[PDB]
Design a protein around this nucleic acid. Structure first.
Length: 54
RNA sequence: GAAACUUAAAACCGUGUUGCACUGCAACCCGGAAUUCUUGCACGUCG
């Protein structure tokens, strides 16, 4: 329950650490900070794991 | 006084249901408690 009250916070902290720096490598893509999550197929290998190093 | 079987013959027998009437019967819950439950992205990879 205490985790669910800070759910938009951990969704933003996992956004800046997992795929904000990977998204900024490819040109023409503008980085958003967001409470961003990923859902469903076609989302990539990075969204369905917890591996850190490239 | 010594000498001559109150003897012989004759089933205590014949006939006759230990028989007649009578419910091993009346009353009684195989009943009371219990989640087919616990974990699991129809998804990953592109000369």
């Amino acid at each position: 329950e205490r985790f669910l009250e800070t759910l938009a916070e951990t969704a933003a902290s996992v956004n800046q650490a997992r795929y904000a720096e990977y998204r900024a490598m490819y040109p023409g893509v503008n980085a958003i900070v967001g409470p961003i999550v990923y859902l469903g197929g076609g989302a990539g290998y990075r969204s369905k794991t917890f591996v850190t190093d490239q």
